[PDB]
Amino acid sequence: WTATSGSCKGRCFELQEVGPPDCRCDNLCKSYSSCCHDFDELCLKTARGWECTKDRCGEVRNEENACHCSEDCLSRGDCCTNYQVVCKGESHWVDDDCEEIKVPECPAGFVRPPLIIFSVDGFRASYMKKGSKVMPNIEKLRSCGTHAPYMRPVYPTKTFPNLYTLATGLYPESHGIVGNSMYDPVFDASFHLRGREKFNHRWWGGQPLWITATKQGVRAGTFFWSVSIPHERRILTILQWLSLPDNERPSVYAFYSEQPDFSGHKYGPFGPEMTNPLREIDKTVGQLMDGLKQLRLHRCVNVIFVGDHGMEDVTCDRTEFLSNYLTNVDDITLVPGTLGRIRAKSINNSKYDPKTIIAALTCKKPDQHFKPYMKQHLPKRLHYANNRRIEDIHLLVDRRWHVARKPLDVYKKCFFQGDHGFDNKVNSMQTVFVGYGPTFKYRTKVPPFENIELYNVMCDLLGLKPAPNNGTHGSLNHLLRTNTFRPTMPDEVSRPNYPGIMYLQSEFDLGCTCDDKVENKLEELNKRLHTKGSTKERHLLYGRPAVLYRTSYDILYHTDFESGYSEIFLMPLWTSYTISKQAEVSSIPEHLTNCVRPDVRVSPGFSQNCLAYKNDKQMSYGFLFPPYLSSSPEAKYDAFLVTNMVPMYPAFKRVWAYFQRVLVKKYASERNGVNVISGPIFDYNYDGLRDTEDEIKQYVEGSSIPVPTHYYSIITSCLDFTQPADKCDGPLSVSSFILPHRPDNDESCNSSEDESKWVEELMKMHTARVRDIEHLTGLDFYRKTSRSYSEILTLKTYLHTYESEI
Numbered sequence: 001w002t003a004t005s006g007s008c009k010g011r012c013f014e015l016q017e018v019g020p021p022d023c024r025c026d027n028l029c030k031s032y033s034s035c036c037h038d039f040d041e042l043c044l045k046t047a048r049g050w051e052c053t054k055d056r057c058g059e060v061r062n063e064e065n066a067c068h069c070s071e072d073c074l075s076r077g078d079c080c081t082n083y084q085v086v087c088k089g090e091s092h093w094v095d096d097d098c099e100e101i102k103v104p105e106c107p108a109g110f111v112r113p114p115l116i117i118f119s120v121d122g123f124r125a126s127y128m129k130k131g132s133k134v135m136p137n138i139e140k141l142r143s144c145g146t147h148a149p150y151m152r153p154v155y156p157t158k159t160f161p162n163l164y165t166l167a168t169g170l171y172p173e174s175h176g177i178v179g180n181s182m183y184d185p186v187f188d189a190s191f192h193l194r195g196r197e198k199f200n201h202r203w204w205g206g207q208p209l210w211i212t213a214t215k216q217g218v219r220a221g222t223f224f225w226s227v228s229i230p231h232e233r234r235i236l237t238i239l240q241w242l243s244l245p246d247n248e249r250p251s252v253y254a255f256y257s258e259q260p261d262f263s264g265h266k267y268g269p270f271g272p273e274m275t276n277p278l279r280e281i282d283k284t285v286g287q288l289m290d291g292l293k294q295l296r297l298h299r300c301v302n303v304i305f306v307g308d309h310g311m312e313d314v315t316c317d318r319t320e321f322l323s324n325y326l327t328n329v330d331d332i333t334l335v336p337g338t339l340g341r342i343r344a345k346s347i348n349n350s351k352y353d354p355k356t357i358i359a360a361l362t363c364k365k366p367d368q369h370f371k372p373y374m375k376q377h378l379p380k381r382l383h384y385a386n387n388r389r390i391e392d393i394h395l396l397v398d399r400r401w402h403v404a405r406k407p408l409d410v411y412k413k414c415f416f417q418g419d420h421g422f423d424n425k426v427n428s429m430q431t432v433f434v435g436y437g438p439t440f441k442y443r444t445k446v447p448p449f450e451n452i453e454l455y456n457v458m459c460d461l462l463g464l465k466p467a468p469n470n471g472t473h474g475s476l477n478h479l480l481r482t483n484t485f486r487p488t489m490p491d492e493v494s495r496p497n498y499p500g501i502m503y504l505q506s507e508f509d510l511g512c513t514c515d516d517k518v519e520n521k522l523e524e525l526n527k528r529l530h531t532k533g534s535t536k537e538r539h540l541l542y543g544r545p546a547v548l549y550r551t552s553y554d555i556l557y558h559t560d561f562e563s564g565y566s567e568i569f570l571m572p573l574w575t576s577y578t579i580s581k582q583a584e585v586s587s588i589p590e591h592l593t594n595c596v597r598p599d600v601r602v603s604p605g606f607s608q609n610c611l612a613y614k615n616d617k618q619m620s621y622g623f624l625f626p627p628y629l630s631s632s633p634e635a636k637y638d639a640f641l642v643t644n645m646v647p648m649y650p651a652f653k654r655v656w657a658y659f660q661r662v663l664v665k666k667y668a669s670e671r672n673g674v675n676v677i678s679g680p681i682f683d684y685n686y687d688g689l690r691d692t693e694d695e696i697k698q699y700v701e702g703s704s705i706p707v708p709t710h711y712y713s714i715i716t717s718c719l720d721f722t723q724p725a726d727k728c729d730g731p732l733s734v735s736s737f738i739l740p741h742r743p744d745n746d747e748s749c750n751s752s753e754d755e756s757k758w759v760e761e762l763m764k765m766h767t768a769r770v771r772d773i774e775h776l777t778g779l780d781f782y783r784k785t786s787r788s789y790s791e792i793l794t795l796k797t798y799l800h801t802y803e804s805e806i
């Protein structure tokens, strides 16, 4: 119940939301069906439209008008945005030359530059170039301010997950808005786009910017607007709030536009009908900037123009139906569209089997336009698993396609020509970022970045301490003229041991054998040096990784590679090696095929053993430093040390062997040398974070050798590829991956073919940021470079996407 008999008199767009059953006058009252009876009359005035005209100049104030052209309007803060242009001979903001804003130029009483967020739904990154002719205001913001060629949204590339990621700095799995539609099994409640359940606070986790601001004494405008409030009224409301007394005035504001998403769904991303929505958004930007200029705030406010996701061409005919795959289609519930989520229709049905469902959906049709995954097997870059609202079974849908349960769902729900929600690496899903104001840089282009990073920057812009989030604070310092955040490197927690030769061969009873007993102070002195780290500067280019948790580990040096060997996990946490452009690939000699050698620096009790591999019929082994890339026949023996061995399913060995034998050399030739750091990852609870020992669900049979869920590699070279990786004087270039350690290659439909037809494709799908690997391993990389820490943070957030040019 709401007693709507109260009044909005002097309360229009009030900032504090009044509690029930008292009627509301705020910008969300319509959405709650709770506005006072006179809200439309008083707060949504439309008379005479939105623009001053010559004959309205100096008019007698008529309070009925939507906006004013009278002489008193500036002090009242309610002129039409074009007032000074029409009535006072001023120019529109867009017609002014841009001039660097070196310092905030603010009216007296302003304690900080306000921040205005202008968010646009469905604003695809390529609109900045493709629509440039019809968006002069936005184009001026872009060229005069700081801009990225694009900004990467989060997965799924849906509206609510992205807007709330923007607001919180969190992945959807952490903030809890994991789709536009959700079922929470603990609440036993459903979240929908239409309805009232979505208003319950329990869905919305983390701490959004408006709450962070309020808790730290920075006043915030209300970010959300009821659909029926016209854009012109939203702008006028913001401008009116900016005229409040200092003690009452917010420092942070948001405008939201439902366009171009609304039209993009109907007409496709580049439908000829899309020009008008783009023109109209630009006009709104013009109104804001003209309004700011009138208030003498155009060189004081920081403005962020930001989108949530792009838009792809998608039509009804491009729909895959689960009824063409499953016999039992009525025993499931599907969340459909540009992603699929499957669960049992009834929790009381004991015939339901996720294993048989996945199999029935796996590589069944030649051109199949979706791929099934257990959520924990999704690419780690998506960070889409650690939430009870995310169903165990997920369908990654090809761009341009839908998945639905049955054909009747599609014609009894073509209408639409556009949609979004696909993998967040997809070019059509990319969106926009422009920052303009005293705190942003002048005429500066910055590399693409992820929207999870913005919360930290918005906190910086407002002098706020950010709540704990998934951004890497400092990684976007290069966007800013001032207010940069200067982080310190995390402290190493565990110092390594440096073991020398401490064990005789015969102390080892590992069931390993090697044909290495085929035997000089000239070379014996030399190998002693190598074991003491004489080549470490070549193979460890950026310092040793820091171990940021409590553990027991050894640094092991070799001619060709260096490792940090965990006595706890019985394998390296990391293995580092450099391969020059000139390096040659060799084979594993016949006599060494099954060679495994005890490491006399490491105790039998802290070593793996070959017998466990013999006994475990499912599990084989591989090596982290590849024997194929040994610098010499004698150095090759180092590669067969038991301390370089890791457990690998035979199916995974196909992937790993191809990476190591073919791809590393290929990258070294293309990139002028590469430094490689590889290692295991253990993430059995799929939280994106390093497992402790007691979280490991699988061991090599009969042993304490834990099985990795994933294997990573970080591949670094010089950004200026005229310089070799090991002699680089400037910025670095990186690509990384986190490959799932799976007992089959079911993910790769073409895996029965030669590795050259499918392995690199798989690796590209599992591309990763160094930062993702840091979370998953508790390691901190690039500790010793000649580069600024902020630059290194940006490098650590880089994702190599393998898409063509935007």
Ligand SMILES: *[C@@H]1O[C@H](CO)[C@@H](O[C@@H]2O[C@H](CO)[C@@H](O[C@@H]3O[C@H](CO[C@H]4O[C@H](CO)[C@@H](O)[C@H](O[C@H]5O[C@H](CO)[C@@H](O)[C@H](O)[C@@H]5O[C@H]5O[C@H](CO)[C@@H](O)[C@H](O)[C@@H]5O)[C@@H]4O)[C@@H](O)[C@H](O[C@H]4O[C@H](CO)[C@@H](O)[C@H](O)[C@@H]4O[C@H]4O[C@H](CO)[C@@H](O)[C@H](O)[C@@H]4O)[C@@H]3O)[C@H](O)[C@H]2NC(C)=O)[C@H](O)[C@H]1NC(C)=O
Pocket: 170, 171, 173, 174, 175, 176, 202, 203, 204, 205, 206, 383, 386, 387, 388, 468, 469, 470, 687, 688, 689, 775
């Ligand atoms: C991205 O950034 C985020 C933010 O930094 C990272 O997420 C953090 O990770 C931490 C470690 O996983 C986690 O810390 C835990 O906090 C527990 C208290 O959590 C509540 O309070 C916080 C603070 O206000 C709040 O943010 C939380 O909000 C979550 O839950 C609510 C409702 O459930 C949701 O609305 C909200 O969306 C959010 O959900 C997300 O996180 C939860 C986990 O909290 C997931 O379950 C969801 O799926 C979703 O992703 C909470 O309201 C605290 O109790 C924990 O301490 C326990 O666990 C450790 C064991 O390791 C132990 O030391 C403690 O003693 C204690 O153990 C006891 O409980 C165990 C479990 O029941 C039990 O097994 C034991 O026997 C003990 O009884 C823990 O410290 C932190 O909450 C989240 N924060 C957020 C916002 O998600 C994230 O990791 C980053 N991602 C990457 C890839 O880097």
Ligand SMILES: [Ca+2]
Pocket: 682, 683, 684, 685, 686, 687, 688, 689, 690, 691
């Ligand atoms: Ca984990």
Ligand SMILES: [Cl-]
Pocket: 156, 158, 178, 179, 180, 181, 335
């Ligand atoms: Cl969804």
Ligand SMILES: [K+]
Pocket: 613, 614, 615, 616, 617, 618, 619, 620
């Ligand atoms: K085996």
Ligand code: NA
Pocket: 512, 513, 514, 594, 595, 596
């Ligand atoms: Na052997």
Ligand code: NA
Pocket: 745, 746, 747, 748, 749, 750, 751, 752
């Ligand atoms: Na396969």
Ligand SMILES: [Zn+2]
Pocket: 122, 159, 261, 262, 265, 420
């Ligand atoms: Zn949409």
